[PDB]
Design brief:
homotrimer; Single alpha-helices involved in coiled-coils or other helix-helix interfaces; 4 domains; two-stranded antiparallel ribbon; 26 strands; 49% strand; binds a molecule of 3 linked components (BGC-GAL-SIA); binds N-acetyl-alpha-neuraminic acid; glycoprotein (chain C); viral attachment to host cell (chain C); coiled coil (chain C); outer capsid protein (chain C)
Chain lengths: 289, 291, 295
C-alpha cells in the first residue's frame, strides 16, 4: 500500500526490482537513457540533441528540408554555356558536316581546283588553247619561230612564152617565207628572144626542197588574176654582140596548179636573139589555213 | 520492520493507485514490452546495425567525417561528355569562312564573279574567256592570229594626179588593194599620162573610191603625215611626142600621205621634150597605221 | 519468514532508473527530453529531421530527392536539364576538319588554307581568284589588259647616219648618208637617200657600216638578217645610176641585191648592165629590205 506493485510497459517488476525494456536504438550511457547511433551515417548527438550532418558546400536546409546547393552545378552550367554561346552545328555547301563522324570537309570541283602538297587550295593550271602561228614558245604564249622565218630552196624550170617565142631555163633559187609573205629569189639567167609582151613561168610542181610543198607557194589571192608587185627590170638584148639593156615591166600575174606566172612587158623592142636576165626577187602574200 | 520503497516518481514516470506508468510523446512508442523509437513511413531512417541509422544510395552519396556527401562518380558521365567536346570543337570561323554564332550555321563567303557552286554542289572556278586584243583573236576555239590581219583584199577606183613645174593632169584608174600583216599594197595599172617635169609628184586620192568596208583612214601610213623616202625604186617611163617613146629611168618613192591623199615622188634620170608619157604598172607599198 | 525486513513494493531499479529519497526518476542524455510530462525526442534547429506524422522522419526537397527501398536517392529530373543541352550538342557539331580546312583544337578556330599565288581574300572577305598575268613571249604582250601583239613589233622608226663604201677592182670610195630605218614585223627596211659617188666597176660592193651610226634605241645587232651571215641573193632589183665625166650623164641599169651581213656590215652587190668610162656616179634613192633576226 502506497507502494508500487505493478508497472506498465516498458517498465517491469521482478522481486521488488524495477527494470526497463529497450529496443535497438535506445541504450544505456553512463547512468542515462540515450539514443544509440552505430557507425557514421550522418546522424549525431550534438548541440543538445539529435542532428543530421551534411557537407556544407553541396547541401543546405530550406524550411527544414534537405536541399541541393546551386553552386554544385555551376562548373557544369558554365562549361556548357561556354559552348552554346558559339559552336558549329551545321555547314552550307560547298561545306559539308557529317553530324555523325563529327567531321567537316569541303566540296571542290576536281577539274578546276586542287589541293597543294602543302595542303593549300589552288587553281588547276590549265594549258591554254593555241592556234598556229600562235604557240608555246619556251614556256609562254608566243609566236611560232616558224611563222617568223622559214628557209628553203627551189631547183626548177623557168619558161618564157610570148607571141610564139618559147624556151626554158634551169635555175637554182633560195626561197624565204616570212610572216604572211613568200620570197622567191631568182638568180641571173640567160635566155633567148623575148616579145614585146609575154609570160615567165615558174613551175613549182617539181623541184621544191622537202619539207616544202607545191601548195606552200599558193598566193593568198589563190588563183585570181592580179597585177601584184609590179616593178621595172633591165634585160640585156643582143645578137651575140654587146647587149643593149631594155627596161621592162614585170609583175606577178597569176598562180595556177603550182605554176606561178609573171608578166613581162613594156619598154619597146629591138631585133635580138639572146637575152641576159638579171637576178629578180619575187614576193607575194601567201595562203594559209 | 518494513521498507515500502518507491512512493513517488518524476516525469516521464508517474504512479497511481500503486501502479507506475511512463508517458510518451510522438516518436516514442511501445514495440512489444520494449520502449522504441517510432519511424513512420519510409523517410530514409531505419533501425539496423544495433541502432538508428540513415540510409542512402551508395552510388550517389557517401559519408565523409560523418557528413552526408555527393560521390564524385555521380558526375563522372557529365565531366567526360563535356570534356570530349572541349578538347576539339569549332568555336569561331575566319574569312572566307563564317560562323553564325546564333543559328549555329557555318558557310563560306565567295566572289561569284570568278567562283561558283556547281550543279552537284561542288566548288568550281567560273569558266571564262581570255582578254584578247586584235590582231590576236578567237580562232575557232583557240587563241590565234586573226585572219583579217593576215590578209584582206579591197579595191580603189579613183584619180591619180601628176604635178610638176606647172604641169598638171589626171587619170582614172583602178587598183587592187592588199592589206597583209602591217603593210598595205596599192597595185597600179600601166597607164597613159602627159608631159612630166624632171621632178614632180604623183598623187593618189583615197578620199573617194575605196570599196567597203575600207575607209580613207585605212590608207594612212604608220609614220602618219611625216615626209619620207620609203620604198625608193627605179621605174622606166616612156616619153613621146606622138612617135616612138624613149624610155627614161626615173626614181620613184613614197613621199608623204596627207589628208587621205598619198603623194609619190617621181624624179631623176634625164629628160627630153615631150607631150605624152607611158607609165608602167607600179605597186606601191608601205606600213599601215594601226590603232 | 525470519527475514528482519520484508520488502513490499519496488525497492530497487536498474539504470536508467534511479531512486533517491523514495522517489524514482530516469536520467536522459541529449536527444531525449520532456515535453509536457512525456518522454520525447529533442531535435535542435533544422537539420532536416522532424517529429511529424506520428514520429521521427527526415525531410528533403521533393524535386531533388526521393526514397527508394528506404534510401535517399537523387531524382532524375534534376539532371535532365543537362543531359538534354549536352545531347543537343553531341548530335550536330564539328570535331575535326580536312584540308584545305584546318581546326586548332586549342583555340577552337577554323580557318582555310589557300595558295596566295592563285587565290586571294578580296576587300569583302570573299574567296576569289587572283587575276594572274599569263606567260607571254614577245612579240606577244600585254596590250591594255588583253593578250595582244606588241606595238613595238608592229612598227618602229629610227635612223642610221653613217658610211656607205664602194669596192670593186681597185675602184673604191665612201660617202656619208642620212637614212631612215623602219622595222615592221619581221623585216627591216633601210631607206637610203640619193647620193653621189665616183667610179664604179662592172661588178662591185656597196657596204653599209652599221657598227656606228645607229640612233638609240637601236643597236648594231638589230640589223642582223634572219639568215644571219649566209651569202644570199635577196631582194634583187634594178636601179638606174647616172655615169659621167663632167658633162651629160648616161643612165646605166644595174642589178642590186642584199648579199651578206657580217660583223655589223651589210654588203650589197651591184653588177650587170653594161659599162662605160667615167669618173662620177649619180646614185638614186634606193630602199633595201630583208628579214630581221629575232630572239
Ligand atoms: C555518429 C557517432 O559518433 N556514433 C557513435 C555512437 C554515438 O555517439 C552514441 O551511440 C550516441 O549515444 O556511439 C558508438 O560508440 C559507443 C561507445 O562510445 C564510446 O566512446 C566513443 C563515443 O561514443 C563517440 O561519440 C566518440 O566520437 O568516440 C568515442 C571513442 O572513445 C564510449 O566510451 C562507450 O561507452 C560507448 O558508449 C556506438 O556504437 O553507440 C559509436 C558510434 O560511432
Ligand atoms: C522504416 C520502417 O520500417 N518504418 C516502420 C516503423 C519502424 O520499423 C518502427 O517505428 C521501429 O520502431 O514501424 C511502423 O510500424 C509500427 C508498428 O511496428 C511494429 O513492429 C514491426 C515494425 O514496424 C517493423 O519495423 C519490424 O521489422 O517488424 C515489426 C513486427 O511487426 C510494432 O510491433 C508496432 O507496435 C508498431 O510499432 C510504424 O508505422 O511506426 C511501420 C514503419 O513503416
Ligand atoms: C526540426 C524541428 O522542428 N526541430 C524543433 C524541435 C522539435 O519541436 C521537438 O524537439 C520535437 O519534440 O525542438 C525545438 O523545440 C528545439 O529544441 O528548439 C525546436 C526545433 O526547431
Amino acid at each position: 500500500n502506497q507502494g508500487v506493485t505493478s508497472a506498465g510497459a516498458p517498465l517491469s517488476i521482478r522481486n521488488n526490482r524495477m527494470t526497463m525494456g529497450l529496443n535497438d536504438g535506445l541504450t544505456l550511457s553512463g547512468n542515462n537513457l540515450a539514443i544509440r547511433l552505430p557507425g557514421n551515417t550522418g546522424l549525431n548527438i550534438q548541440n543538445g540533441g539529435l542532428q543530421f550532418r551534411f557537407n556544407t558546400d553541396q547541401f543546405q536546409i530550406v524550411n527544414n528540408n534537405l536541399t541541393l546547393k546551386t553552386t554544385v552545378f555551376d562548373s557544369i552550367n558554365s562549361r556548357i554555356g561556354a559552348i552554346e554561346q558559339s559552336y558549329v552545328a551545321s555547314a552550307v555547301t560547298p561545306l559539308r558536316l557529317n553530324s555523325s563522324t563529327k567531321v567537316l570537309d569541303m566540296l571542290i570541283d576536281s577539274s578546276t581546283l586542287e589541293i597543294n602538297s602543302s595542303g593549300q587550295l589552288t587553281v588547276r593550271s590549265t594549258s591554254p588553247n593555241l592556234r598556229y602561228p600562235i604557240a608555246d614558245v619556251s614556256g609562254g604564249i608566243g609566236m611560232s619561230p616558224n611563222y617568223r622565218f622559214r628557209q628553203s630552196m627551189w631547183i626548177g624550170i623557168v619558161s618564157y612564152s610570148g607571141s610564139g617565142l618559147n624556151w626554158r631555163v634551169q635555175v637554182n633559187s633560195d626561197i624565204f617565207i616570212v610572216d604572211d609573205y613568200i620570197h622567191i629569189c631568182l638568180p641571173a639567167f640567160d635566155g633567148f628572144s623575148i616579145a614585146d609582151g609575154g609570160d615567165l613561168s615558174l613551175n613549182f610542181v617539181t623541184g621544191l626542197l622537202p619539207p616544202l610543198l607545191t601548195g606552200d607557194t599558193e598566193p593568198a589571192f589563190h588563183n585570181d588574176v592580179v597585177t601584184y608587185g609590179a616593178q621595172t627590170v633591165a634585160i640585156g638584148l643582143s645578137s651575140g654582140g654587146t647587149p643593149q639593156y631594155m627596161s621592162k615591166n614585170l609583175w606577178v600575174e597569176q598562180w595556177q596548179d603550182g605554176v606561178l606566172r609573171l608578166r613581162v612587158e613594156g619598154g619597146g623592142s629591138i631585133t635580138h636573139s639572146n637575152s641576159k636576165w638579171p637576178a629578180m626577187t619575187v614576193s607575194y602574200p601567201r595562203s594559209f589555213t
